[model samples]
Target chain A: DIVMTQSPDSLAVSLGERATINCKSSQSVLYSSNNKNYLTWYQQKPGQPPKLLIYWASTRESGVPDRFSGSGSGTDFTLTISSLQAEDVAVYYCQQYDNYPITFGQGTRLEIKRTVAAPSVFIFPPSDEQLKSGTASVVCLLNNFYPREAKVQWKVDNALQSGNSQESVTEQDSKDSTYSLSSTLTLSKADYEKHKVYACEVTHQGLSSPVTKSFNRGEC
Target chain B: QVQLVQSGAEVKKPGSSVKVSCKASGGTFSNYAISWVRQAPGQGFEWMGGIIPIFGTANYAQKFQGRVTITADESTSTAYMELSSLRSEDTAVYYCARGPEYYDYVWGSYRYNYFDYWGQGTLVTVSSGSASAPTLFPLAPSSKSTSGGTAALGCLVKDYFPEPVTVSWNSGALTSGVHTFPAVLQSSGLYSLSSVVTVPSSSLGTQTYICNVNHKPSNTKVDKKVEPKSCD
Candidate 1:
């Protein structure tokens, strides 16, 4: 089996600017017998399945936009997007079908350098109805963020707390095309009474100054 | 005009083994490499491995290295991929493709891999107790209104082991003139069926149309949203 290795795990290209990604195979993918290179490229968006882009190292697949192209041959190949559109932000992969056990490049993530939308985060304090039962739940919602990956942290009186509470998943609003997610901090009612202050800190690619929220138990 | 035609669907018992074949035509059998890719019902693609038909040279994904064996018969111009100790995870649609090879005259050979020509998928069902998951493909919704003033949506489901499957619209199980074609058997031994739903053509953009598929055998549920093309 031939090994396919891609260069630049990630790339940052400005909107409307050109972007290039390269793939190198461990051995020759060129079948000298027919003078053909069995190489292809695919574009995989965050939520959707992959779409074939280029094949035969240069031929664009039917229905692909003209701006996308494939070049080079043999063990080295390139997939270029003449002008990156907002929709073109995706991970690109190169594959070699010429080798045994078929090989694929790791993938190159192309993202907009700094134009992503900032995340919207809000913290909610535990309601009285739940506080009466014993444990209190603090909720922090992250909404309308771009570039899905985001981080959330819970703090008690400015100290970080970690108990595998990092369990949260980013969900897509299929209709609106945005993202939404939330996290909950669980603690005994007594702990909340003693702490007096709880905070939720959020970080996302869209944020420049970072965002923080708090539940002032004293204000209650 | 290179072509790759694969064998029919298959059902294998756990702890056993299974093999699938791909026959190449229209060119020198050894000119291109043959590859095996699978989609575990409702999951993404997995490259099991491939073979260069000339020398029977084969390579496999690390995850399947110990469980898969790829071989080719140049005389018959066919390639085969066999697996040992099948498990539930092995249930998937296996596809064979022409892994094209290229040439380098300059600095020379290294990499550029692609599955150019491909075969119609072959389904492999691994069931200890009836492993099943119906795969669904939704046809494009009607772009134009019929004389009756309504549009139609279609769902063609394939390769399900059990007899139980259901289709629904966004509102729920359709109560309108829904047409469900009879389930048919494929050479791979799995069942396939098609279903249709009709609605007011004007509702094309006013309401969301989704094809909801429910199959319990492998606990697979798929919601395929349909965006009817705009009428020019």
Candidate 2:
């Protein structure tokens, strides 16, 4: 009867530092019958089944590292890594089994923050057909970003626009462990034509300042 | 240490059939169920079905109900998926996984459905032709008298192929008297299925009933009207 939501879409932590992810449930996962919150935590790496880390709220599963722990009760919970390790640089998830139709939280990715290069950004204009239909989408692709923690924002003219963009999960390149991010902004062709200027601003700790890539309308 | 070892890759023509095998080892083979899963190139996994070798009982996903057949052999510790009249879309990697065992919990018992261990997959390719759809024939509806003036209407579906056709009934104002019999395998490797719905004699002629047969391989559906006759 509860839904789970996770926060901090991504995090960058240095080795041996603490990293924590939060999860909130719509209702109390604690069952009065057993006085136990039916919650669990999992760690998933690329191309692998989720490995169980913690279960029954605060109990760590067998053979799990001592650095990993779970806390909290009722509707709010946390999964903490007392010391980050390179092997822990995967996605963490929280799940609830207190009720039928078990649910999971959106994954929180953890990366090792190091002296890595910033992402190379590219912007592509909407297609001719999309522009003709009065609705178009512009794609901003951030490639080869290390530590995998970054944010992308869209600016119309000089003002920031929120809540109209779709961002993909950080995808890791298999050959190298580096990641990529892609975000698409949907806008009206009329707005694009009138404004004439659009920009995508990417912010990452690896970079000293936000990287801005601007595009002009009618260029496509 | 239980393991499921599946067969090798297969390349067959569209109208032909292939049977892939999974041999279990290192444990009591009959203790758990064997489930089959399919993954097309670049597509997600789909659960085909599962079978209990000890009892020879099986259950199928609705999408693969009549399109695939799952069978098990207790003596050999083996399970099999027999795919017939394959199409291009049937080109996929087939995996055989072990279903979890149900154990008594302190409070209650729990059964795990997610596959914990899997076998090396068998790649199947269907090309160079197309498969023919199953032929459907609806038999006339008949009625038999039970005690107290109650009647039963029987709907028969004859001669369908690819080993899994679905038969369902749609009727109005009737008691819960619907029954679907298991598919009977015919000599030609086709299937014959039948179903029945029981109703009160007084309620007949006032309600309309229909029998539906859905065959997935050919994407064909046939519905036949059922007219109840007077019970003697």
Candidate 3:
């Protein structure tokens, strides 16, 4: 069973504004036999039963609108809403259909807040693992399937940035079938402490604002 | 898609008792344990208990473990729950439910929770009764004088066992009753018994009528009082 780790443990979203939920599985859910990913999204409204939103990675279940769709494969996945609706005020959960005794993410409560800018994602890696290593290269991938066209970039210590790394692209088989991208960078464990901040930002036309995820590989 | 139709209301008096029934429909009732819940008229819901007819074992909500009792009539496909030492505060709507599964003897789809299919609630009102209540009366009262006529009240024991059971009323009261010996039935292997009692016309309108049934393993006795208006 893969443990699901979600970001923005809690969120405040404004009605009609955009909101996003990111879930990462401990293990790759991509089963080569079917060439499919076993990730699903569920929305649980207060005082009612839960509803299924996205399943099999990026395919929206019947009746679910294009506003909600999943993207990414293996260890990464994202559930994005083009424009948050008031009825969408609820806790969004992610599950992996890869194994029995399926597990659910810690849940992100999306509340209605101002539409000034998309909230940033902050990453906290386990402390002990980073202590003993060779090259500690951590890459953040933003996989938003809804809105069809989403972009990704990197930033360091609060500034727009770039690196001598490789960027990869793959077209997703979603209803809109858009291209997804990934950036891979390598660094020695020593340099990780020098560049204390790293970020992956997503820019999309349908979004009310850009979304960002930040992480620090530095030791205290 | 499955449903359940529960029996109607029952009215007993304080220190008396009553048994309510719930019958399952449209599905295999034996496939799941029927969970029972108690919802006070204006209070929060509470799980009263549950019974598995197939196993003949019951598990009750911790708060109600000793206050309530449950049993089943497998042949008729009916589940019964009885409340003893009835009090006015015991009046409430009770429902019978079936769940997707059981967790440690607790029945329901979600573990540690109860209720999936709920039966329309049935109401049981416990009040005060007199021992002199009439046992049998005409279809309707003809004169005010005949309203106080005394009658014989008896338990029509449909089935029974060698269990030492007895029927008694308030001592020193103008009520007289007897428990017939357990008669071996020819069709079924079980034994059967009956109790009949008579009271004075004056006692008919002022006394409480009760039937006490007891069995071994425990000397617990179940008592039900006949209300003049409701139980009559």
Docking class of 3: incorrect
Q: Cα miss at B104, model 3 (Å)?
A: 5.1
Best by TM-score, which number?
1
Question: Candidate 1's error at B9, in angstroms?
Answer: 17
Q: Compute the lDDT of residue B36 as modeled in candidate 3.
A: 74
lDDT of 2: 0.67
Docking class of 2: incorrect
Better of 2 and 3 by TM-score: 2
For candidate 3, the per-residue lDDT at A118 reads 24
Worst 10 residues of 1 chain B by lDDT: B138-147
Off by over 4 Å in 1: A124-138, A146-151, A156-160, A167-181, A186-199, A203-220, B1-46, B49-232
Between which residue pairs do clashes occur in model 2? B66-B164
Worst 10 residues of 1 chain A by lDDT: A166-175
For residues B1-232, could you state the per-residue lDDT of candidate 1 as single tens digits? 7667777666678989988898877765756777788867555466887777665577788889899998888888888889999998888878877755555454464322666677766778787656578765554453221325666655556568754466777748465645455555554566666555657777776877777777755667888776664333
In the range B1-232, model 2's lDDT, one tens digit per residue, is 7777887666578877889999988855656777787767654456677776766777776766777899988888888999887887888878887754343265564422334456777768676633234433222223212325554554555456543455677733333655455555555455555555556756665767777766654467777776643232
What DockQ does model 1 achieve?
A: 0.10
In candidate 2, stretches whose alpha carbon ends up further than 4 angstroms from where it belongs are A118-170, A173-220, B1-232
| Candidate 2 C-alpha lDDT tens digits along A1-220 | 3578888878877778999999999999886666878787877665444566887789887679999999999999999998776678788878776654445677787877665768766555554545676766665656557866788998888778897776654445333456665566777787767787778899987789998877676542
